[PDB]
Amino acid sequence: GADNIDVSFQTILQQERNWAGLQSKSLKVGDITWSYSEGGSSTKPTLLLIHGLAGSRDNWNRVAHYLTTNYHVIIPDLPGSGETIVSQDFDYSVPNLAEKLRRFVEAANLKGPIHIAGHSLGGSIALLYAGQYPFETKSLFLVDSGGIFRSANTIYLKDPTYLKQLLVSKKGDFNYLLKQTMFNPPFIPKEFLQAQEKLMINQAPQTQKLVDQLIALNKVYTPDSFAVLTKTIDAPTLILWGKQDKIINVEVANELKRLLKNAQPPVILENVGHMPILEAEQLVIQQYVPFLLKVETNQ
User: I need a surface site. Which of 29, 82, 112, 217 has the fewest CB within 10 A?
Assistant: First the structure.
């Protein structure tokens, strides 16, 4: 008819980043070409936002929109995601992702203690970063974070081989993934869903490598190992969960609270799944902005 919309999905992503007050940047650090979003004034406190498995920097756009006015926001595409380029034989283990993220923070010249937020696998990376670089970590915000828990009660945590069922490798897989990761998914036009699914299918060989590394990491380390790591983290911490999270059960939020010395009581969002940053961004910001103000005042 007379009202056809003809647009590239990449142009849509560009417009959403602009709406969030972000611009796309690139930085070569060793053998990695990092793709990242950056917003806000360099005079403002630095915030590093870390996405999860098979995600991308754009997962944080809805939340970042509320932070780029008063904060200096940095959102990288991790190896295996978005436009970040790595070697064909890259090491996708969580320890290597945390160490290479530190090299990126250094090369991006983001000095002093920085506020760090992590979603899902991003939360696991944020925890390792906070433990290895405590004087470089101003605060921690864990959104349905991974880890190795005694209170684990999902098939994905009990046997990470089940993470292979969440891989997007063929048409229709993205709809299956959304049904497992979200309880209140946002509005996603069918045409946008299909475009996003295709990008994930293109990254599938890398996601498979990440998953295999995660399976091997879970065989090596235990909840005892995780307790040793969390014992070393003194950073003030905010924990937020979706009550309906099918990937990492909500009981784990209380375990993280018990394990982290300076963690606040967890925020549990009713009718929200594993991705509050896309399912309830205004409710996430309602908690995170007063937390950041409190940490800034106490410093």
Answer: 112
Domain that holds residue 83: 1-299
Distance CA 230, CA 271 (A): 29
User: What count of other Cβ atoms lies within 10 Å of the Cβ of residue 124?
Assistant: 24
Q: Which 3-state string (H, E, C) describes the chain?
A: CCCCCCCCHHHHHHHHHHHCCEEEEEEEECCEEEEEEEECCCCCCEEEEECCCCCCHHHHHHHHCCCCCCCEEEEECCCCCCCCECCCCCCCCHHHHHHHHHHHHHHCCCCCCEEEEEECHHHHHHHHHHHHCHHHEEEEEEECCCCCCCCCCCHHHHCHHHHHHHCCCCCCHHHHHHHHHCCCCCCCCHHHHHHHHHHHHHHHHHHHHHHHHHHHHHHHCCHHHHHHHHHCCCCCEEEEEECCCCCCCCHHHHHHHHHCCCECCCEEECCCCCCHHHHCHHHHHHHHHHHHHHHHHHC
For residue 175, the domain's CATH number is 3.40.50.1820
* Solved with: X-ray
Query: Rounded to an integer, what is the distance from CA 1 to the centroid of its chain?
Result: 41
Annotated resolution, angstroms: 1.7
**CA–CA separation, 296 and 299 (whole Å):** 5
Are the C-beta atoms of 154 and 163 separated by less than 8 Å? no
